[PDB]
Every structure is written in structure tokens, then in C-alpha cells.
Design an enzyme around this catalytic site. Sequence first.
Site, short mmCIF file in Angstrom:
data_model
loop_
_atom_site.label_atom_id
_atom_site.label_comp_id
_atom_site.label_asym_id
_atom_site.label_seq_id
_atom_site.Cartn_x
_atom_site.Cartn_y
_atom_site.Cartn_z
N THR I 30 0.88 -1.36 0.12
CA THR I 30 0.08 0.23 0.25
C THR I 30 0.95 1.28 -0.19
O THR I 30 2.15 1.02 0.23
CB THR I 30 -0.99 0.13 1.32
OG1 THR I 30 -0.23 0.11 2.48
CG2 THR I 30 -1.82 -1.23 1.26
N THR I 31 0.50 2.56 -0.28
CA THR I 31 0.91 3.65 -0.43
C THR I 31 1.43 4.38 0.99
O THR I 31 0.42 4.22 1.94
CB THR I 31 0.42 4.62 -1.10
OG1 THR I 31 -0.16 4.22 -2.44
CG2 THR I 31 1.26 5.90 -1.75
#
Lengths: 229, 196, 226, 231, 241, 250, 204, 195, 243
Positions: I30-31
Site C-alpha cells: 500500500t502507499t
Amino acid sequence: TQQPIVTGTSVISMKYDNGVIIAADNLGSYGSLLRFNGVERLIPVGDNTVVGISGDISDMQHIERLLKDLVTENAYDNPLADAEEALEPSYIFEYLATVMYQRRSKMNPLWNAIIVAGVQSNGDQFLRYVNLLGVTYSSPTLATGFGAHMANPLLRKVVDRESDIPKTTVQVAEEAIVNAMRVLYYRDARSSRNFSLAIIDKNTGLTFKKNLQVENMKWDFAKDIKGYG
Amino acid sequence: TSIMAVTFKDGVILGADSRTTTGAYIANRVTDKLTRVHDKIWCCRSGSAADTQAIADIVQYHLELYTSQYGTPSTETAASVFKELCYENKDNLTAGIIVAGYDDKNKGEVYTIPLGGSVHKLPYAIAGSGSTFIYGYCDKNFRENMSKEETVDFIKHSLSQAIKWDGSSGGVIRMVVLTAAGVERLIFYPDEYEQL
Amino acid sequence: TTIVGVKFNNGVVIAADTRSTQGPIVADKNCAKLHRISPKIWCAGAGTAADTEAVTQLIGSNIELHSLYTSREPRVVSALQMLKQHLFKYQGHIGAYLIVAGVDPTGSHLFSIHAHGSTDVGYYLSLGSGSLAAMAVLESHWKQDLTKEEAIKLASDAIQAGIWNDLGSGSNVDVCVMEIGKDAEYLRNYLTPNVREEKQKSYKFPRGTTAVLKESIVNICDIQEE
Amino acid sequence: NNYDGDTVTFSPTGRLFQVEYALEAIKQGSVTVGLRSNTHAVLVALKRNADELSSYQKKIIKCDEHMGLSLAGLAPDARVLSNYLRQQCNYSSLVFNRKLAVERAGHLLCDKAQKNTQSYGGRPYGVGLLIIGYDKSGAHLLEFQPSGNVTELYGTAIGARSQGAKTYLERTLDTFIKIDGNPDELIKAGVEAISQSLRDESLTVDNLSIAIVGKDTPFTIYDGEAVAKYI
Amino acid sequence: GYDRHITIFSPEGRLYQVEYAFKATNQTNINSLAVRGKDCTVVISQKKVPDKLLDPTTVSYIFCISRTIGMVVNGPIPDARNAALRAKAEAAEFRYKYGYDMPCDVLAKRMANLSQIYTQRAYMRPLGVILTFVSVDEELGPSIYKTDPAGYYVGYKATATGPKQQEITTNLENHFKKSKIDHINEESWEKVVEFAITHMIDALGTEFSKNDLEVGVATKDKFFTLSAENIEERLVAIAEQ
Amino acid sequence: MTDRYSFSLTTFSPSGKLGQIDYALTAVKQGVTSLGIKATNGVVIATEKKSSSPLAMSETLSKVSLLTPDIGAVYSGMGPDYRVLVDKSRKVAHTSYKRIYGEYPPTKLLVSEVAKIMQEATQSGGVRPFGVSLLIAGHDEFNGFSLYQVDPSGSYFPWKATAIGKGSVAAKTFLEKRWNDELELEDAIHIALLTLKESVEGEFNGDTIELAIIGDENPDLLGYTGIPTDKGPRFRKLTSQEINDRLEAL
Amino acid sequence: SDPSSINGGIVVAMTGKDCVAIACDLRLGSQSLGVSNKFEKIFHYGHVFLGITGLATDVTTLNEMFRYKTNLYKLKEERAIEPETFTQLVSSSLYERRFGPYFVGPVVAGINSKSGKPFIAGFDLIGCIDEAKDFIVSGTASDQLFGMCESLYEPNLEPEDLFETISQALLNAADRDALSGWGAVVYIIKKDEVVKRYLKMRQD
Amino acid sequence: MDIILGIRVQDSVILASSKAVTRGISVLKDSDDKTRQLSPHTLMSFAGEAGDTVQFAEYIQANIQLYSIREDYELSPQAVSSFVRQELAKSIRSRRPYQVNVLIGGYDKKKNKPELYQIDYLGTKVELPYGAHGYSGFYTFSLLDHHYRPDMTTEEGLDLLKLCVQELEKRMPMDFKGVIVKIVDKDGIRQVDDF
Amino acid sequence: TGYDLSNSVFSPDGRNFQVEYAVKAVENGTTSIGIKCNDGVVFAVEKLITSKLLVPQKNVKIQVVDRHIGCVYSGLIPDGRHLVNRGREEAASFKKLYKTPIPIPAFADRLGQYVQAHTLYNSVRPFGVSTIFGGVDKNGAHLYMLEPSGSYWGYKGAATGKGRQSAKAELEKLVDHHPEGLSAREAVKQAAKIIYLAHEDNKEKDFELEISWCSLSETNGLHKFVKGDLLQEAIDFAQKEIN
Ligand SMILES: [Cl-]
Ligand SMILES: [Mg+2]
Ligand SMILES: [Mg+2]
Ligand SMILES: [Mg+2]
Ligand SMILES: [Mg+2]
């Protein structure tokens, strides 16, 4: 096995209706030499606990660093570190008691006598003692060193048993503690006039008082005393 | 031994006598007890000469390695390294060390580490066998924010009295001044300080 | 034992007596107390004689390896640092008390080192049971900017004070001079002021004086051929 | 393929196949369900037998008075990990006079599993765990994967056919979270959840295993005729 | 073909993992140069900050190993910092044990020995870096000693490292063929830095701004790196004649 | 971590060959030529200083190394491997001999210790053999002058004269024609310079040639006077000028 | 209690013109009790002779240790160990037990086979070397031996004259020591002949 | 343990050892055999600290029996005595040393000679015509010094031994409850059952 | 070939393929981002809501080291936890010996050397995370990003994970439009926007936003989580910008 070098004298404490009070003077003795005059021996942990330490000062500074590390460690991966999962007085005491008993069992003790004073989550008063041997006990009043012999008798006149605790206000308790510190200054050769006092209350929280002095001293009667017989 | 360190307006000054004894024999009358652990962090040594030399050499090593990685260490950091060695090896050491240093952010600082390995930050500190005789004098005469000349006089007069009464202290009075301007060594001979 | 070290104009000189003892008995009358750590770094030892020899040879060995590793001539401060850290680790149980002197690319040096690991710097030093007798001479005649000849004279005079006044010291004076830009010159038996006088009588016995039970040839040769 | 010989080797797409194979062992295991309200937390587990002469393999392990788990996968690995949790719960009580927080227990299990995924010679754990508990912040449910990933949830299921129970709990979310002060109804919801994962077989008296922990309820396991009430 | 994976001999008596570590050395696409003056030793290196989100003050391949010794590295930053930390530890330990500052050539030999071990022991890989150590030694004077992944090292009058090392090397060779001396005959280090930058400009055929270069200077008793504004003053002097 | 390579990396192949040792010898074959010649009153060892760059100061790279005051060594093959072996050889001369007997080891026994270290890198776990052959020249009281070769396997042999590395086959033939048991040290140096010229392509002078002798005691290199029994090292490295003087009488 | 005087005994060594001599008594005891009159204290490894006084268990142990070490020396060196070299080996071996030492007083005697030079040496229990030109003494009557040797010794004595000198030094020293005597042996050592003579002496 | 005596005559070695075991106040046993057969022609008697004596003796016995089986050969008395000496010399610098003194009586079948070795707890070994440990020698050696001959028969050795025991029984303060006597010769080891 | 089957092996290029494969695991995560402001740093991360059964705000991702350093990472979450545990040990030992809390550059190298060590041997696997971390020390604010190779540098802004390209572009705009600098409160708002914008690469499932910060003026140089009203304000600001 060692010997204490730089040392701190009595720590005294008691319970009252809404919390606990603890006190200790600001001296670091080097034998009979009153070497260091600005030593803080009451160390707060959070806003609910105060740890009072007597005996070896080098070991006190080590314990102070252990408690500082305990707060850092408790906050790790803990979203409720300032709420439900904050350090309790009972947690702090049990940890110190474990360390003290382990160190005496390796024949390398931390040369101290410690009193942990605080208020628990449910409002209950906490007051318990531990020393270099790992010995632990609780009482409505607690004191170390000279304080055990001179402060406890005075503090026990206010709270003699458990049922006296709800009848004891914070004003009456603090008054009793301050008087005991004066008596210790009169009679303990390794004490000082300057001391610190901490109140932990279930309503008003932690009140930490620094730079307190023994006052209202009786010396005038000395002028009439002459010779030794 | 008579040693002291005193903070003043422009920084800190360390002072010491030069006498080293084996019983009543003076094994060295021109000893240098002011030892450099970093450019502007020095220390005064008392107790076992072997122990304090060993400790100082290890600290100098630690601070040299600290500097290569993290830049100039604070005086507090130097005191902490001294403490760690003194506290953890308290059973096998006889060492009483005063640490003095100059930062630009913190200015002059003095830390004393007595026998047990505790640390105490103070405006000034005295140690060694000769210090006992000048507790009264130093407490009465020390002021905060003195000038360089006043601090030199305070130390010169203080150690003069320590030397006068303590048989284990004597020789020349050595001093090291730590300020922003740099590091200055001073020496004062018996014919000077004995007539004070 | 009496040992001294003296700094001069362009170098340093070290000297020692030549008596070794076991209690009140003189074991050797011409002992060599000046030891070589490296060609131009020499030291003299007092205390436990085996320890002074052993610690010298160990650090001397490691100094030689260090010199070969770094392609540089050994330094006196290296010998000092290695000696003191070895001695400190053994907490005085290695009874070596040394005066270390020498020349190297940095200059001329003179140090003392004690069994527990403490070291000191000086222009003139003395060690051993005759150190107080030697130091009395050094404190009386030492000055700044001594010549080579003056330093050799002062050093040997200081040893003589030990020889004549200390019962632990005696016999001869050994000297080693280490000058900058020169070979170190070891002067074994530099002074010989204690030769024994001729005896009153010869104690050579007539042949056949001692009673003998048995005679036999001892085979020191290896097992023979054929 | 060429990158699944040991746990110390990434694949060209950044995958760890030995860990993925360990995850596969959980999918072969028997179904177990976890769910909680604000007062109680419940475990329901379908036990598996070898044959009609054999016993049904136990699925639920108690770790402390306030904490325990259910397993799916290699049972001996669950014994190793549950033993570690027992020790950590115990260390916290003995040294700090403190009941180990369920969230901290999850962190410890993650780190123990991680070390077996980055070193040569070892292997990943081949079991999944559902940890329930009641501590100072109320009821909790955790899901453990041997990849090291630990997640806090209202409800979940692991093992074979666990997807049916997981969807049911996702529908019922708003209902079962409100079942406060009624242990029997919360268990009913869990028994109804695990029923969405059954095929051919049904819940019998030696088949079903239930555990519960709550406000004034120590971690207790129900087996035998004690679960007939819920069949 | 597992003789290519670990540091064992190939049938030709070659060590392929060592050869491939030499290739990793040029992964940063940076060139460095070192020269000696009368009283100093100068090292310059290209500085490239390709991302605007980077803090440019933290991007560096020059290291202050000890007070007297500086080190520039050609190779990836993780291996560079590995070698930097070890060199700092070795220099500090040397001073503690032997009572004097570790010479530049001795540190180079020590790091070269450590590198040799990685070429002989299978469990350890070579570091993909070339290390150029500089100082003004108290016995030998201005000193340049360079180490590589094979464990080889030698002293230099001057040296160059990087993808375009040959161009810089030949340029330096031609200058010393003219002067017939082993150093830059100049009093001040400022002018020795100017010489170094000028000859890198000539050899690479590129101009430099203040942010395109990184400079380290060794004098008696200290090694230091120049700021962007110190480099700017150097560039201005070069342009004004 | 931990070194998990506790198994041998050199093993016997079906034909009885130890591959890694053979490959190490191949690395030696690619190395620059070095030689040694024994005379009646000395020994000479020599090699070419193959400078990797003209900017490099080749005087800082020592191919001929003092092991003890009376023993020297030269090599052909991998330079770094040689350097660490010289470090180990210098140390073992002290730890396994001088710290025990109070004197430096005889040539044959120091050679034996170096040989053992090289043998172990051929059998111990997780290591490769050393990629060098050594030529060790020395003198000691009871054995006189001697010259030894040590190979990657750990095997060693004594020689009257020999060569290793690049052009060893041709050099050994050249030495067979010139060597006799009546050679003086100066004659051996002359023959060494003649032999070495054949394998050198470029410059041939005192700056590109490294040469050392084991000969008479050098009291001028001892560093101190006063002990009659100590007379100085027998190992001496010839200067650039001393080599060039003998290249005019060539 | 004192380990160096439980068993008793003495060794003495002297140099002469192109020769050396080494001698010892034959007693072994348990304090006051005489146990053996055949306990020889001089051993040899090739042409190098070693006398050892002190605790008898250590005397035997060290002989076995130096036989061990000189045998390995000879196999590796392909020659017999010399007196100068062996002296260093004894010193090294003793110092390696610095803090748990062998309670002994060793004495080395021999002629260097190459130079022909006579050699003697002595040691304390931890390895310190005494290399005297004239004589070396050791054991429970070392004071008595020092007195005898200092007056009787003169340099450059011929082998048969040196025998008389060293014999009289031993005998008269031993007769003033309770824990020494019960027989005596004298070795006269020349470059390639060694003679061993047992002396007649009082047996109390 | 107390008295242990040994005498080497023409063709045999005779060992005599006391029978008493005393633990402080009481004599717990009066028939104790303070010896172990190490090999068919080698016997070892022992005395010293309680427990350590039997532990050391049985340890030595086990080791010699192991050697005998491994090589199918009996070690010479000299070789056995050297092995025992080394074990005691090793023991004296241990954490807790064996406080055990021994006599080793053996008949060498190769040389056809009896041999007697005396070794104390320090590892002090001597070969003797006759020997003892403790105070036993103080009472018996003057008799042995007078009467002993190297050409004595076994019977004459036993008679000289009886005179020694009689002197011990007269002048020693402790009651050692007599001795067990064993003979070692070319035919092996046997016990004299009337003494 | 075969050079990519074992860690620490150099390929004929001079590359360590196992480290490059670890980067692929990071890119799959995920970012997560970091923004350096005027007197501190802000950290933010995207948390994918896999199911309704996930308890909101409970599965906390950002981690504190000591009391002044924040750490966030993308990739294999357990690997990130292992690295933070080591970081906590390094920080504790530094403070034990030197008294002062570990400086951020000092802490950066401790993590760097440890990650680099896992590229030296074939008996260990490289870290499957890129870590963004930083805080306030005596010399001010510092932001760092550390890769599987052990490589790290200082940053004005940093991003990693699946939506790193989108995030980087947004960060570059902030650097250009604010040469004078960004306030801590502004940085929190901007961090919320950037995560919401970067969520387009993960648009299938909805997500939960998590933010933390260390600021000299706003948090006294201590690491704190953004909660309640300040978090909602940042969510509102973010939702307004995407519409
Ligand atoms: Cl090395
Ligand atoms: Mg005085
Ligand atoms: Mg390798
Ligand atoms: Mg006698
Ligand atoms: Mg008698």
C-alpha cells in the site's frame, strides 16, 4: 557485593481519604560529608505514580533510567498509552520488586530502599515498599531508614488502621508529613533542611512541590542549657 | 591530589596540583592531572592512577569514534560515557573524575563522578584528598558568571590552600582554560602561590 | 635494583646496576637489566625479574610485527600503550615496573610504567629499591639542556649512589645511549668499580682427594651404525 | 518453481513461495469461527476425526484466564505458538502484575513467525490462529497468519470453506456486535455462522467445540453434552 | 557452473564474483579524482541529485574517516557506508591500541586485507566499491592510497576512478610528463583544488556549477569537505583566467 | 548469518584431480615471472614490478618481502593472497617459534609453517586455495643458505635455482646452463638479471625490477651497537641505483 | 607446607677450560622421612644436561615434558637442541604457568657443538634466566652452595681439577643441610666425552 | 585409610594393608580390603581420604582393564606406575585433587623380576625394595634397613613383615585391626588367609 | 544464469537480483508517504479495508521509535516490524551510552547498516520493505527513506508502495510552490490529499487514512498520531480536493 558510597536518607509516606503523600530531602551524603545539596530523590512516573528512593545514589540514578525506559517501552505500539493501557503504580512496583530480588539473588544488589506511591485506575490508593533484599510490604504509613523509627510513630497517630483512612483529609495528612520531616531534621545527622513533597490525589491528580524548607523550628530553649552537670 | 573545575562567564577552567605519592615518597612532583578526552572536553583525575588513565584512554577512544560518526559530542555525553565505565565496574575501580567542557550551545559545563559512579551536574566541583580542606573557602568565595581573571584567582587561591594543608598535594598548579577562543594552558610555580 | 633515565640535548640515556638477588643472597653479580624492545627503544626493569623480561619480549615481539605491518619504525608511545594495557588487564599480578626510553621519527621519549598500568612522563626518572638514592643525585645535579657527555655522567653517578647506598643494588653500571639520527649504543659494564681482590690462598685440591664409588662413560651419542 | 526450495529466496515478482505453501496448509484445515460483541468474545470450531473409531482433534487452546485461541493447520505448530503465548502472558503477570493486552500478544506472535521467514535452515509455521480475549479495553478478536500478518477484527473464519461463515458475519455485523450481556445469543450467532461452512456433515455433540471469554467470564471451553443446548 | 556464484577458482584461475564486483563499482555513474600538492591532498567527485524530492545536503560519497584521513567511494551507497563505518572503527581502535594516529597507507592495507578475505571465504561477498584514502601523513607527507574488490592496493602520485577514469588518468599522466615532478608545485590548497577541477573539466569535456561537484581537502592534522559556496569561489577563480 | 559453509569446497573428481588446486596453479601460471638463485656465499630472489598504472607509485607495492632478518620471500600469482600470507608468515615465525626458543626459525621450518596454512585452505570448510606460488630464500647457522618453492597445494621443494609464473619454463632452462656449485653471490645476481631480462617486455631498470639478497650480515642495518653476537640482518633489498650499476656490467 | 622444601635436594653447575660440570645429591624425602637414596635430579637430552630441584612430582613431570619437547624439536629441526636454545625453551615453558607454577629450580649445563663454548644457566620457578660465567646453584642448600662455590671456584680449571672443585662444593654444602645428601653424582662434560662419577659420602 | 606396607623380595612383591575403617568415633568395619587388582600380575594398595581412595582405585582399574582388552596385552609394572603417576600429577592442580597414596606391586613377566613402586598423592614416584605411606615407615624402616636382603625368599619376606606389623601393633596409638597380606609373583596374585 | 537464485551473488552486470526482487514486494504494498515541514515531519499511510469485519482505527500501521522518531513502511508488514524492533534496540543502546536521544542521521545509518548486512550472505533474505522515517533532533527536522539494498538518503518529501508515482508528482508540486517551506498543519492537510489522490492505484477497495507527525511547535518534538477533529478536518480537506 559492594558498599554504598554517595547516599540518600529517609523517604516517608502515608495514605489519606482521596490519595497518597510522599516526601524526601534533597541531600547526597559522602559518609559524614554532606557533599551534594541539590539531589531530587522523588521521581514521578506519569501522572499517577511517584517513586521515592533512599540509599546508594549511583544505583538510584540507574533505577531512574530504568523507569524512564519503562515509559518509552510502554508507549511502543500502544494506542492507549495515555489512557486504559497507561502504567499503573502496581505495574511499576512489581517490576522494581522483580529487579531488586533478582539482583540480590546474584549477590550484586541495588543498594536502595524504595517506596512506590500512587493512585490506581479505579481510584484505589497504592502504597508499597521494596528494598535491596527484595523484601516487600504495605501499610497505611511507610518510611525508610531513620523515618521508619521516627516518622512512622507520628504518622500512625493519624492513620492507625485501615478504617482511619477515609476519616483523614489531605490537609491533615500533609501537615503530619511536614511535621515528621522537621523531626527528622532535628534528629538525623545525615538529613537536610531542604526537601521535596508529592501528593497523588484521585480528583486533583499529581502535585509535585520542590524547594520546600523545614520551618517553625524550636531552638530558643538552648540558651538556658549550660555545662553537662 | 587536589583537583577542581569552575564554570564562568566565557566557559570553564580546570585546575590541579602536580604531586603523585607512593606512601610518603613523591614518585612524581611534576605530574599532569589535566587530561584531554576531546578538543574542548577535559577531565581531572583522582584515585588510582592506573584506573583513571585506563578509563580516560577508553573515553578518548569512545569520543573519537563518536565524532567520526555523529560529530562533536556534548559534555553531557562525555560525562555519560565516564559514568557508564565507573558505575558498571564499581567493584573493580577506585576513580573520582571531574568532567569539564565547552559547547557553543551549552557553554561551560561541569560534571562530577564520585566513587560510586553517580553523576552530578554542578556550577563548580572539587575533588581529591586535598578538597576536604577547601569546602568552606570555595562555598564562601564562588560566584556565578565570574570573569576569566577572577576564576583563575579563585582556583589559584583554592588549590593553594589545598596544597598547604594536604601532604598528598603539591608541586605546580596547572590549569586549562576552555572557551570559544580555544584552549589555553597555564602553570603557576610555588614561589608565586605560596605567598598568596 | 637501581635504574635511571635521563633526557638530554639530542636524545635520552638509560642506566642500571648489575645485581640480582633472592632475598639477602646475590644470585648473579653481573646481571643484564637493560632490555631491548626494538633497536632504538630500550627499557630497564625492576620488580619480578621474569615478569620484566617476559613483558618486554612479548611487547617487543608485537612491536616488531607492528613495524613490519605498517612499514614504519616503532614508536615509544606504542610500546607504552601496549605495555600499560597488558599490565592493567592483569591488575598488578604481573609485577613489572619499567623505565621506557627511545628515539623514533617523532623524537626522543622517556616514560615510567608501574605494575597496575599507570604511566608517567619526565626528563629524569628512577625506579627500584635504590630509586631514592638515585633520585637524590638527579634532583641535585639535573639541569635543562644537558649534553650527551653530561647525561651519561649524571646517569652513571645516579646508579653509583644506588650501588654504594642500597643493599639491593651493586656491582657494575650498564648504560645505553639513544641519540636522534644515530644507532643506539649499548655500553655493557660501562663502569667496573667492584672487582674482587685476590684471595689469600689457592683452594685447588690434589688429584684423588675425593672418594669415588663407581666410574662409567655416559653415552651422549645416538644409536650407532653396523 | 526455481525459487521455492527454501524460505530465504524471493521469486522474480517478489513472492515467498515457502510462506505461501505454509498458508496452503491452513486452507486444508477444518473450519473455525471467531466473533465478538462489546461484552463477550466467542470461538466456534468444527473438530475433525480420523475415522469412526477415532476421537475428534481438539481445536481450542487456553492461553490465560483472559485469553485463548483456536487453530487451523499443523496442530504441533499451534502447540509451539500457544506455548509461547502462555509464557508471554505469564511473564507479564509475574514481572509486571499485568494481564497481557490482546493487541500486544498479536505483535509478539507476528515477530516470532517473521524470524522463520528470513533465515536459512528454518521453515515457516504451518498453522493459522484465531485469538480471543478480554482485557482493559474490552473484548477483542485477532487473526494470525504464519506470514506474520496479524489483524484485529469484529468477526472472521479460517480453514476449509471459511468463506461462507465470513460472508454471513459480514451481513450480521450490525446485529451481533450489539449482543451485550447475553452469552447464549452470541454463541447462537457463532453456531449459525459456522453452519454456513458445512457440507454433507452437520453439527453433532462430539463434533462441536465452543469457547467464550467476557466481562465476568474466564476463558472456558465447552465440549460434549455442554454444547447439545446449541445443536 | 557454481564457480560463478561464489568466490572459488574457475578453470582459468579467475574469480568471477570479484570481477562482477568491479562492475557494480560503476553503478552510480560518478567519477572521482585525487591529486597531491606540496602541503595538501585534494579529492574531487561528481555530485548528481536526480530527484527534486531529495535533500541534496545528505547526498554524498566523501567520508571523514578520522581527523586526518578522508575517503571517497566509487560504488553503491549501502556498500560505501558499510566500508565507511568499518574504516572509522578500525582507525579509532588503532589509535587506542598503538597510541598514534593510523596512517593512510596502513588503513588502506587493513581494508585491502579485509577485502582479500571476502575473495577467499565463500560465505562473505565482496563489497562492490573502490575506496580512495587521502591524507597528509606525518612521515610520508601528502598521500593517496586506493583499494579495490580484489584486495589490491597501492600508493599514487595522482589517481582517478569511475566510468570515465581512463580519460582523466591520461590527462593527469600528460601533465606529470611535462612537469617531471610527483606533485602539484603549489603553496595553497585552494589552487590545488582549482587545478583538480580544471583538469577534470578538460578530461570530461563538461562544465560544472557549484552543485555538480563535491570536494575534500586534506592538510596537516585535518581533513575537511568544502561547502557549495566554497566550491563557487573556486569556480569563479577558474573562469577569471 | 553464521558461516554455514562448513563443508569442503575442494574435492576429488572421478579422475583423482583436486580441481580447485589445479585452477589455483593456473592462476599462478598467469602471474608475473619471479626467480631465485643460490650461490656459495648467498641467495638472490628477483621479480618484475609490473606497474598497473604510471600514476601509481610502484615503490609502495612490495613484491619482495622480509619475513625474518635472515629470510625473504617473493611470489607469482594473486598479489592480495600473497600480502595476507606474508602477514601470517611473519606472525607464525614469532608465535610458533621465537616466543618459544628465543631465536628466529630456520628457513625450512618457516617454509613448513607457511605450507601448512596453504594446505588447510585446501581442505577446511568454506574456503578456496591460495592463488600463489612462493619462493622463500634464507640463511640459518646449521643449514647454511637455502631456497624453497611453495605451491597452492601446500607442497614445498628445495632448489639450487628456479623460476615460477609466466615464463618459468624458458627461465628454468636458462638457469640450468649457467648454474654451478662454485658461483659467488655477484655471479648469481648477474645471472638473475640476465634471466629476468628475457621475460620482461618494456622498461628494464632499477625502478621496474625488484631484487633482494640473503648474504653477509649487515651490522649497519641493525640499528644498535654493543652486543658482539648480534651482527645484523642477512636479508637486504637492493636499491634502484645498485641494480643499475650491475646493468652496465651486463 | 612450602612446596619447594617438602622433598629436599640440590644441584650445582660449573664451567672450566673447554668443559662444564653438573652435580646433584640423590635424596628424596617426605619432610623428615628419608624415602629414596637413588632419586637422580640430572637428566640429558642429547648433549644438553638439565638438573632440577624442588617438588619431586614437578621434577619428574618437567623431565617428561622436556623429553617430549626436545624429541619433537629433533624430528622437525633434524639436529640436537643446543644449550642456549634449550635455556629459552625452559624459560618459556615455566612462564606459561605464571599463576600456577611448577615449584622447581632448574639448571642447564652443556657445550655448544659448533662453537665449542662452555655454557651454564639457572632459573627461578617462573622462568627468569640467570646466565653466569662461573657457577649456578639450586635447592634447599643453595645458601651453602653459594658459600662453597664463591671461595673454591677459579676460572679455566682443567676437567680433572674441576671435578675435585665441584665435588667438594656439593659434598660440604649437603652436609650442612638436613634435606640433602644420601649420595651424590658428578657429570664431567667435554665436547665429545661425558664421564659420570658417584661419590662416597655420609649417609645421615 | 591407614597402614600400607610393601616389600620386594627375590621372586615376588608382598603388600600388607590394614583392615580397619573408622568414621570418627566408631570402627565401622574390621575386614576391609584396601586393594585392587589392575591386571593379572599387578596389584595396587591405597590409603587417603574417604571415598576418593576407592573412586581413584576403581578408575585406574577400569583404565588398565580397558588397555588390556584393546591390545590383548598386559602392560609392564613400570608402564602402569607411570600411568598412575601422571593421573595423580594431573590431579594435584585440579579443582578438587584426589587425596590418595598408593603402592604398586607387580611381577614383570618379560624381565622375570618383581617390582615395587611408591607413589603419593602429589605424583611423587620412586621404585624401592620396600616402602610405605603415612606414619607406617617411621616404625618399620629401621627393621627393614637391618634385615632386608635382595635374595630373600617369599617366606623370609613374610617373616620380616610379621616383625614390622608387631612393632606397629606395639608403638602405634590406633587399633588398625590387623592386615590383609597379598603376594604378587610369576603365577599372579594370591591372598595369605592366615596372618 | 542462476545468479538470481541466491542472495549476495553478483550477476555479470554487478547486480544483486535478490535485492531487486525484494523491491517488487515493496511495489506491491500500500502507499505510504512522508513530508518534511518547517519544524518537523508528517507521515501518512493508506490502509486497505479488505472487509467490513475489520475494526476501524484498530490495526495501526505507523510505529514510534524512542519518543521522537516515526516509522512507516510499504511491502511485507512483518519485515517492517522486525526492522523497527531492531531500530528500537539501536536507539536504546545509543541513549544508554551517550545519554542524548539518537540523532536522526545517526538512526538512519543504524537501520541502513542492518539492512545492508542482509545483502552480504546467502543464509539470509533481504528486507521486503521500503521504510520512510524521521523526526526532530538538536539540528532540526529530518526525513529519510530506506530501500531493501540498504540505500538511504535525506528527503524533502518521500513516497513508496503501489501509488508512489502519483504521490511523487504531488510532492514535487509542493516543493516547487513552497521554496520558503510548509507549516506542520498544512503538511497534515497535504498528506491527507496525497494519500486520497494515490488511492486511485488501489481504487477497487475503500481505505482508511492514518496520519502522524513530529513538530517542534505543534508536538514539542515528540511523535504523535493525528486523531479526532484534526483528522476529520484533514479528511474533509482531502475529500473536497478530489471532487
Ligand atoms: Cl589485517
Ligand atoms: Mg603539600
Ligand atoms: Mg566470498
Ligand atoms: Mg645432609
Ligand atoms: Mg639424618
